[PDB]
């Protein structure tokens, strides 16, 4: 696996935060290396969501941050609830994938290959 | 006398007749085919070329060594064989006991022969003088600033130069090594595997050239 030029605690934190944000937005923009490394984490969380049993819920609560989404009509529900009620159904029949990645050109401030990781 | 191209799978252990633990390496020799029979008047030295494994056949627009190229298909079709992945030759063999197109099988080896396995070492990459050359390194305390670097590279004004062969840092690995006087413990003809006492050079999934000890 990759280290992302960062320590262990700071990476653990970055990976879980990036996975949460992806789950919120359903497509985000970042650099290749971190997309390649958040792919597995988000894919595994969705797996914890395709079962929905209380054990998997409690276990997926480890990674996701506690965030609130305001849906249409001022309806509110958290990241766990999204994962287990709006994304489990979408991928009940698909047996992998769950994400795609679309390389983009280098950014300006660096030569970093920005990419967009999106939930498929 | 005998030679087979194989690849290394791993190491395990077997127990011997009197209970002894035998350390072993599993080598997989399958579809070894003779592709030529070099001759003294045709090429200047008598030997035979063996192709191992099996590539796929030519395809237009290939982008990898998976498939054979037109040049290799032709070489192998002259021996009515499939394109192969690794090709080596053997000199110790009697060229007249082989035919262009035969299969060399694992059973060429009987239990208790003496063989030499020639492979390539594992790559360690760029390394320094203590790992690459076994050098004693300096003191780690008592106010030292010479921890792992190599020591003097020469003398002084006499030989105002560094002599060739001075053991300095660089790439380690990627060298052909021949371990000598190993032996085979069992030959299995169905899974096509020659088991060799000891350990052999190389990464897992590599290539070993087993032949009969020259000593």
């Amino acid at each position: 696996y990759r280290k992302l030029g960062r320590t262990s605690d700071q990476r653990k934190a970055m990976l879980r935060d990036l996975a949460t944000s992806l789950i919120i937005s359903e497509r985000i923009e970042t650099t290749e290396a971190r997309a390649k490394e958040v792919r597995s984490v988000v894919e595994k969380l969705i797996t914890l969501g395709k079962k929905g049993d209380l054990a998997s819920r409690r276990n997926a609560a480890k990674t996701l941050r506690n965030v609130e989404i305001l849906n249409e009509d001022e309806t509110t529900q958290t990241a766990l609830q999204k994962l287990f009620g709006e994304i489990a159904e979408r991928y009940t029949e698909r047996q992998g994938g769950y994400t795609r990645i679309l390389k983009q050109g280098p950014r300006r401030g660096d030569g970093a290959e920005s990419v967009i990781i999106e939930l498929v | 006398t005998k030679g087979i191209l194989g690849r290394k799978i791993g190491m395990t252990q077997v127990f011997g007749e009197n209970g002894e633990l035998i350390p072993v390496t599993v080598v997989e020799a399958k579809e070894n085919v003779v592709l030529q029979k070099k001759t003294v008047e045709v090429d200047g030295y008598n030997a035979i070329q063996v192709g191992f494994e099996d590539k796929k056949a030519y395809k237009k627009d290939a982008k990898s060594n998976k498939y054979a190229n037109k040049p290799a298909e032709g070489h192998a079709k002259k021996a009515d064989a499939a394109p192969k992945r690794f090709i080596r030759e053997f000199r110790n063999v009697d060229v007249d006991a082989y035919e262009v197109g035969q299969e060399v099988s694992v059973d060429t080896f009987v239990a208790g022969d003496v063989i030499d396995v020639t492979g390539v070492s594992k790559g360690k990459g760029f390394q320094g003088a203590i790992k690459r050359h076994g050098q004693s390194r300096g003191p780690m305390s008592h106010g030292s600033h010479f921890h792992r670097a190599p020591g003097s590279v020469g003398m002084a004004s006499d030989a105002s130069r560094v002599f060739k062969g001075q053991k300095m840092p660089g790439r380690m690995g990627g060298n052909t090594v021949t371990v000598q006087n190993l032996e085979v413990v069992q030959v299995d003809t169905e899974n096509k595997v020659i088991l060799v006492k000891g350990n052999v050079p190389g990464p897992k999934k590599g290539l070993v050239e087993i032949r009969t000890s020259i000593k």
């Binding site: - | 395990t12 077997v14 127990f15």
Partner: protein, 114 residues
Amino acid sequence: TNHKLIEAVTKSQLRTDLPSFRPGDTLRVHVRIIEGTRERIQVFEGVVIKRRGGGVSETFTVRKISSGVGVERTFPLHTPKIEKIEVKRRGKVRRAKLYYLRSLRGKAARIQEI
């Protein structure tokens, strides 16, 4: 599994006449000692300390006290030199390797049955 060719070429060396046990169980391993001019048997008695990866490569360790001097013997599980293993009595532990018995002597090294 492990590599399939490794597992195939070494399947014949595995023993099946052996019982099932776990670290913490005290047991009697019997061994063909071919010492002198006889194949005798020495009933070695100890407490299993650990055991390792499967295949012919599984090895287990047993600990005893000889004359107030701790002795530990590692044995390959499928060694043909072991006639039989009797789990002389079971053992309630909470580890998989019992390294922490190298500092205790006497009742401190106590084990509950079952």
